[PDB]
Amino acid sequence: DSFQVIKNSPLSEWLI
Amino acid sequence: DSFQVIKNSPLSEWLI
Amino acid sequence: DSFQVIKNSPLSEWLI
Amino acid sequence: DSFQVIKNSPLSEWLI
Amino acid sequence: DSFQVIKNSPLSEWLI
Amino acid sequence: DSFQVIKNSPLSEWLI
Amino acid sequence: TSQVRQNYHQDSEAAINRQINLELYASYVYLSMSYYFDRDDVALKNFAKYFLHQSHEEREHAEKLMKLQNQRGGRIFLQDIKKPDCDDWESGLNAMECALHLEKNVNQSLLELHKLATDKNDPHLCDFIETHYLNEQVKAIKELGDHVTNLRKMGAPESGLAEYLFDKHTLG
Amino acid sequence: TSQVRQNYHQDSEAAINRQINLELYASYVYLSMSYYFDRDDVALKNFAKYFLHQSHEEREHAEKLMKLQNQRGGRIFLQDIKKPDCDDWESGLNAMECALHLEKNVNQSLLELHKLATDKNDPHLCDFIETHYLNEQVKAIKELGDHVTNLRKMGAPESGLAEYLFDKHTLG
Amino acid sequence: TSQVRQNYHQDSEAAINRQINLELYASYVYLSMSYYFDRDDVALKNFAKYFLHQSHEEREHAEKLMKLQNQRGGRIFLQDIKKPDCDDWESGLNAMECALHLEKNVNQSLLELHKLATDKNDPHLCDFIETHYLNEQVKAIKELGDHVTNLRKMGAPESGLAEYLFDKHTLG
Amino acid sequence: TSQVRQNYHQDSEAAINRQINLELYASYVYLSMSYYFDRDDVALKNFAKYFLHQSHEEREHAEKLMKLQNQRGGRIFLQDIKKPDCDDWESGLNAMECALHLEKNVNQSLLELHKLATDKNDPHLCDFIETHYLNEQVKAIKELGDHVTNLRKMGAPESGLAEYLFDKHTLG
Amino acid sequence: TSQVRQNYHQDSEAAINRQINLELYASYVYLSMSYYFDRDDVALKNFAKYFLHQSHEEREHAEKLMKLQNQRGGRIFLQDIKKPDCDDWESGLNAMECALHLEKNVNQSLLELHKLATDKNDPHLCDFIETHYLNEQVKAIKELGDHVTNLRKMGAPESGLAEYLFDKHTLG
Amino acid sequence: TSQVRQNYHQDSEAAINRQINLELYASYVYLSMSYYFDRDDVALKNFAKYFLHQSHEEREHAEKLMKLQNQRGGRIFLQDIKKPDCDDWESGLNAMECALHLEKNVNQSLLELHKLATDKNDPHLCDFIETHYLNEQVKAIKELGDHVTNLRKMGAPESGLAEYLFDKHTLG
Ligand SMILES: [Fe+3]
Ligand SMILES: [Fe+3]
Ligand SMILES: [Fe+3]
Ligand SMILES: [Fe+3]
Ligand SMILES: [Fe+3]
Ligand SMILES: [Fe+3]
Ligand SMILES: [Fe+3]
Ligand SMILES: [Fe+3]
Ligand SMILES: [Fe+3]
Ligand SMILES: [Fe+3]
Ligand SMILES: [Fe+3]
Ligand SMILES: [Fe+3]
């Protein structure tokens, strides 16, 4: 459950 | 900042 | 000759 | 089954 | 400068 | 052929 | 922007940051698995040792992705490491089933991570996943597959003797 | 016809060619046995290792008959290696029963191969079977006989614990 | 409730769980410190190596508290590991100042953790903090204090030569 | 169907089974090559030793594909190993020409096997062919190419001295 | 035309010949860099030693491409090695900037060389670039990136002490 | 102009720069010789190894002249390295004849280089040529002279056995 939340996160939330 | 949030947490939030 | 017979075999003959 | 087929083969089929 | 001259050379100048 | 071209070059072409 | 950045997309940069959290999250689940079997009412030493090794292995997978982001000119962005979804594991077999289901999820994320490098025409990033992550994710799933099938053949989790003997002969 | 051929019958020459296929066929069955126990739903490592050794042993038995045919002046004739008769083995006990039934069939073929050399008055060929094949075929059948009787005493194939412990203590 | 639980308060049990997150959080900050100095525009190898060692040291401090909770009969409760408060460190001196300010905060949490065991009359828990945590928290603060005072004597962070030479002679 | 099966197509599974027969067939041809040069009227010991090594190398290539099918969750399907197409080789040069023509055929089958994994978007299978099969198939063809060109420079197969000296200096 | 040529395009053959000149040209620039720092008015021994190693490394990269062309059945075509574009380097920092700008240009040529093998469906050539050239071109650019950023932090090229200390601690 | 320049003429300085190109050109011809014998249709391994050693020997002769120019206070001037005059060598004997004709040309250039130092009254430069270049150019020509005369005695290049045996016994 917590694994798919991180996986489905848009790429804009992982850029500085 | 994030260190004091965990430190000030009540003990009831750390018991199973 | 015998090498191309095996090579040209359809994939259906190699599944269980 | 396949073992007895080879075993029962006549000797003429094993000479060059 | 000399690096791009070699790099931009057509492939026909590098075959025997 | 290419060896004598370099060898016959005047010394003025080898000074900085 | 970086002086060493060449043929490195923002989408590939952001996908590496997401993968770093996924390996850091995975080591957190393996850390919660190891110390469950250290409990007095569980008491399976080689099960705890096995999941402790898995915890320090997912940490080095996250550290290697953090190192790869620096060579390509990208900038690491860190987020919260979420807590494991389960605070209690039913047994040794149930933990190997939740670890098999975890590795298959990690492997799925690498496949689309490899599918993004290919679309971006990033051949160096494609070779980095194939050499360090794709090959080891298949042995991990295969090994956990063997462990699960050897557990419910002995009669686990109903048989407490089954867990004890697997903990001794296989994991030890 | 060969310059080194002396006291070598065509019937003895043809019987050696038939035996070469029988050892090559036997190693093919042991190859299919080994990688059945490597499967994820079987996962018996020392069963796979045991049948892998048997596969490379029947190959050297076929290579020694190929070498013996050259010293006696005979000419090797090769045929198709047939596929194993079973593509699925029920369990570890069922594989040891199909391997015991296989060795007894190989031993039977050597007995009439020894009965043909004697009729042909070929004393060198008789001694070659007795030294390299007859002695090792009785230890092989005896060893597989022990393995089968130790499996259905523990309760195999119904007991999955029986296969796992035999795989560890006996085969490992 | 646990069969091995004796003289172990719920408040002491809950305070250990809070401390486990504090060491896990601390290793996350040291992980973000190490790979900042691995960046191409920073490029301080022994600064990255120094904070990488600090990262694996706070992980073993969290693992030893996880192990202590099992011996006393307590149950580990895990929460989110929060991301570090800073994603960029100004320089090597600014990182040593944020690491000195971090260790002093960790030491403060152990002092009230020791003040709770004493109030609960838990002498085994008091000796566990004094032996494994109180002594090493003073050397850590003292060592970081030396590092900070040796950096702004050379002229850091204005002097880029100061960081480079400290990285070579002191940290290397 | 398999618990460890992930991103594995039936077409990729069936293509691996076909390749296993192709390596098993190749080792059968090398086995018939080795014992042709062991014949009394041929008597080339290092030619027999060279093709004997090639026989045990194609067997390990078939065993590695059998092992790869188990990790990916596929099921091995075995067929007849066909007899070699030639029961007599004209000479040492003619055998190196029939072995060069064999390796080029094996290499062709791997290229379309790599072209099927790419179409199926199977990046793990693509890397398995490139690492273990594509690199070694080019050295094999190159080495056999050297051997053939060094044989008809000496005057083989007309010159029996040419075969004898190549057997000594090159193959020995 | 070659007996060992299989799945090898003329465009891939011609692109390898172009790459051979690019590595031979690169070693010529590193040769002119090394002996600039050997000059009496420069006198930086470990700068000369560093660029001398880079000179013999680009020569082995050109020799490995010359060897790869022979295994694939291609024919090497050699052209003039052009003289370096600069006969004087301003300083140690200016040389590391002209070497960083050189490696990034070499890496760019490999990316389109990898993009041509993929278009030609040459999977062996793709794996040869990824294993031997793509991985080492990123460490080279990263390492030169570190060296440049550590030079203008100390105050180079204005500070002659900065070059001398970097030459001692880092390059020595 | 240089602080270490003493008794060093411009003509001697320019003649050293010309010699550096002549050794760099010579190693380029030996590089094209080595990889011609690596070809599949040539396949002479010890001929390729012999000319590969000659390639790395002419590079050190050019590096020693580059080093000598720095000690005497001269400045290195680099030009294009011209491609070898022949892209195909008829045989092993034809390559040894083109290498003998090359060394005799290199030796001629050193003789007038020694004749210029003497005219300039440069005794240090005269001793540098005699110690490092004049002595080794006579052994090189003598050794290549032996190799050529031993090749056309066996019947090369008509005899392909002659090249193969010389490649084994002499060059190997
Ligand atoms: Fe991982
Ligand atoms: Fe893993
Ligand atoms: Fe046998
Ligand atoms: Fe046997
Ligand atoms: Fe601590
Ligand atoms: Fe600490
Ligand atoms: Fe193979
Ligand atoms: Fe091969
Ligand atoms: Fe390179
Ligand atoms: Fe490089
Ligand atoms: Fe020389
Ligand atoms: Fe020489």
PDB file of N, CA, C and O and ligand atoms in Angstrom, chain J residues 19 22-23 26 30 54 57-62 64-65 103 106-107 110 132-133 136-137 140, ligand 7:
ATOM      1  N   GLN J  19      16.343 -22.756 -28.205  1.00  0.00           N
ATOM      2  CA  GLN J  19      17.779 -22.523 -28.118  1.00  0.00           C
ATOM      3  C   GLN J  19      18.477 -23.632 -27.341  1.00  0.00           C
ATOM      4  O   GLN J  19      19.629 -23.969 -27.629  1.00  0.00           O
ATOM      5  N   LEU J  22      19.295 -26.265 -29.600  1.00  0.00           N
ATOM      6  CA  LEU J  22      20.327 -25.860 -30.548  1.00  0.00           C
ATOM      7  C   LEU J  22      21.720 -25.976 -29.942  1.00  0.00           C
ATOM      8  O   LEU J  22      22.684 -26.296 -30.646  1.00  0.00           O
ATOM      9  N   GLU J  23      21.854 -25.706 -28.640  1.00  0.00           N
ATOM     10  CA  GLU J  23      23.140 -25.929 -27.986  1.00  0.00           C
ATOM     11  C   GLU J  23      23.382 -27.407 -27.716  1.00  0.00           C
ATOM     12  O   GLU J  23      24.524 -27.870 -27.799  1.00  0.00           O
ATOM     13  N   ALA J  26      24.464 -28.790 -30.927  1.00  0.00           N
ATOM     14  CA  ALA J  26      25.812 -28.355 -31.275  1.00  0.00           C
ATOM     15  C   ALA J  26      26.868 -29.184 -30.557  1.00  0.00           C
ATOM     16  O   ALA J  26      27.921 -29.487 -31.129  1.00  0.00           O
ATOM     17  N   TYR J  30      29.974 -31.607 -32.095  1.00  0.00           N
ATOM     18  CA  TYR J  30      31.350 -31.531 -31.620  1.00  0.00           C
ATOM     19  C   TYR J  30      31.805 -32.849 -31.011  1.00  0.00           C
ATOM     20  O   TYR J  30      33.000 -33.156 -31.026  1.00  0.00           O
ATOM     21  N   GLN J  54      35.106 -28.229 -27.202  1.00  0.00           N
ATOM     22  CA  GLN J  54      33.950 -27.552 -27.777  1.00  0.00           C
ATOM     23  C   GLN J  54      32.661 -28.295 -27.451  1.00  0.00           C
ATOM     24  O   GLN J  54      31.596 -27.681 -27.330  1.00  0.00           O
ATOM     25  N   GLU J  57      31.590 -27.392 -24.003  1.00  0.00           N
ATOM     26  CA  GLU J  57      31.268 -25.975 -23.880  1.00  0.00           C
ATOM     27  C   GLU J  57      29.846 -25.694 -24.340  1.00  0.00           C
ATOM     28  O   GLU J  57      29.161 -24.837 -23.774  1.00  0.00           O
ATOM     29  N   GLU J  58      29.383 -26.405 -25.371  1.00  0.00           N
ATOM     30  CA  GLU J  58      28.010 -26.228 -25.828  1.00  0.00           C
ATOM     31  C   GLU J  58      27.029 -26.887 -24.873  1.00  0.00           C
ATOM     32  O   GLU J  58      25.833 -26.575 -24.884  1.00  0.00           O
ATOM     33  N   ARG J  59      27.513 -27.817 -24.048  1.00  0.00           N
ATOM     34  CA  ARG J  59      26.657 -28.426 -23.037  1.00  0.00           C
ATOM     35  C   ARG J  59      26.400 -27.461 -21.888  1.00  0.00           C
ATOM     36  O   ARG J  59      25.294 -27.416 -21.339  1.00  0.00           O
ATOM     37  N   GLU J  60      27.411 -26.672 -21.516  1.00  0.00           N
ATOM     38  CA  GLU J  60      27.227 -25.683 -20.458  1.00  0.00           C
ATOM     39  C   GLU J  60      26.421 -24.489 -20.950  1.00  0.00           C
ATOM     40  O   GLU J  60      25.787 -23.790 -20.153  1.00  0.00           O
ATOM     41  N   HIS J  61      26.444 -24.226 -22.257  1.00  0.00           N
ATOM     42  CA  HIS J  61      25.582 -23.184 -22.802  1.00  0.00           C
ATOM     43  C   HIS J  61      24.124 -23.620 -22.777  1.00  0.00           C
ATOM     44  O   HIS J  61      23.222 -22.794 -22.597  1.00  0.00           O
ATOM     45  N   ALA J  62      23.871 -24.917 -22.962  1.00  0.00           N
ATOM     46  CA  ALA J  62      22.509 -25.427 -22.861  1.00  0.00           C
ATOM     47  C   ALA J  62      22.065 -25.526 -21.409  1.00  0.00           C
ATOM     48  O   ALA J  62      20.873 -25.396 -21.108  1.00  0.00           O
ATOM     49  N   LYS J  64      23.050 -23.449 -19.013  1.00  0.00           N
ATOM     50  CA  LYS J  64      22.818 -22.094 -18.524  1.00  0.00           C
ATOM     51  C   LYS J  64      21.485 -21.549 -19.020  1.00  0.00           C
ATOM     52  O   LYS J  64      20.849 -20.732 -18.345  1.00  0.00           O
ATOM     53  N   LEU J  65      21.050 -21.977 -20.207  1.00  0.00           N
ATOM     54  CA  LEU J  65      19.723 -21.601 -20.679  1.00  0.00           C
ATOM     55  C   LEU J  65      18.643 -22.373 -19.935  1.00  0.00           C
ATOM     56  O   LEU J  65      17.538 -21.862 -19.722  1.00  0.00           O
ATOM     57  N   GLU J 103      29.004 -22.408 -35.932  1.00  0.00           N
ATOM     58  CA  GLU J 103      28.960 -21.297 -34.986  1.00  0.00           C
ATOM     59  C   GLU J 103      28.226 -20.098 -35.572  1.00  0.00           C
ATOM     60  O   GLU J 103      27.492 -19.404 -34.861  1.00  0.00           O
ATOM     61  N   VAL J 106      24.649 -20.785 -35.059  1.00  0.00           N
ATOM     62  CA  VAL J 106      24.257 -20.579 -33.666  1.00  0.00           C
ATOM     63  C   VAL J 106      24.166 -19.091 -33.357  1.00  0.00           C
ATOM     64  O   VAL J 106      23.250 -18.642 -32.656  1.00  0.00           O
ATOM     65  N   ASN J 107      25.111 -18.304 -33.872  1.00  0.00           N
ATOM     66  CA  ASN J 107      25.089 -16.863 -33.644  1.00  0.00           C
ATOM     67  C   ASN J 107      23.865 -16.218 -34.280  1.00  0.00           C
ATOM     68  O   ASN J 107      23.295 -15.273 -33.724  1.00  0.00           O
ATOM     69  N   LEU J 110      20.864 -16.581 -32.036  1.00  0.00           N
ATOM     70  CA  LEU J 110      20.881 -15.707 -30.869  1.00  0.00           C
ATOM     71  C   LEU J 110      20.484 -14.284 -31.240  1.00  0.00           C
ATOM     72  O   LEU J 110      19.913 -13.559 -30.419  1.00  0.00           O
ATOM     73  N   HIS J 132      26.415 -13.337 -21.966  1.00  0.00           N
ATOM     74  CA  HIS J 132      26.883 -14.718 -21.907  1.00  0.00           C
ATOM     75  C   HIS J 132      26.981 -15.370 -23.282  1.00  0.00           C
ATOM     76  O   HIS J 132      27.653 -16.397 -23.426  1.00  0.00           O
ATOM     77  N   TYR J 133      26.325 -14.814 -24.300  1.00  0.00           N
ATOM     78  CA  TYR J 133      26.251 -15.505 -25.584  1.00  0.00           C
ATOM     79  C   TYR J 133      26.730 -14.673 -26.767  1.00  0.00           C
ATOM     80  O   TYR J 133      27.414 -15.201 -27.646  1.00  0.00           O
ATOM     81  N   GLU J 136      30.709 -14.162 -26.697  1.00  0.00           N
ATOM     82  CA  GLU J 136      31.523 -15.360 -26.880  1.00  0.00           C
ATOM     83  C   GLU J 136      31.302 -15.985 -28.250  1.00  0.00           C
ATOM     84  O   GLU J 136      32.076 -16.849 -28.676  1.00  0.00           O
ATOM     85  N   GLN J 137      30.250 -15.570 -28.955  1.00  0.00           N
ATOM     86  CA  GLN J 137      30.001 -16.125 -30.280  1.00  0.00           C
ATOM     87  C   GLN J 137      30.846 -15.424 -31.334  1.00  0.00           C
ATOM     88  O   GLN J 137      31.040 -15.949 -32.435  1.00  0.00           O
ATOM     89  N   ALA J 140      34.453 -16.937 -30.865  1.00  0.00           N
ATOM     90  CA  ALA J 140      34.450 -18.291 -31.410  1.00  0.00           C
ATOM     91  C   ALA J 140      34.549 -18.278 -32.929  1.00  0.00           C
ATOM     92  O   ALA J 140      35.313 -19.053 -33.514  1.00  0.00           O
TER      93      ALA J 140
HETATM   94 FE    FE M   7      27.088 -21.441 -27.094  1.00  0.00          FE
END
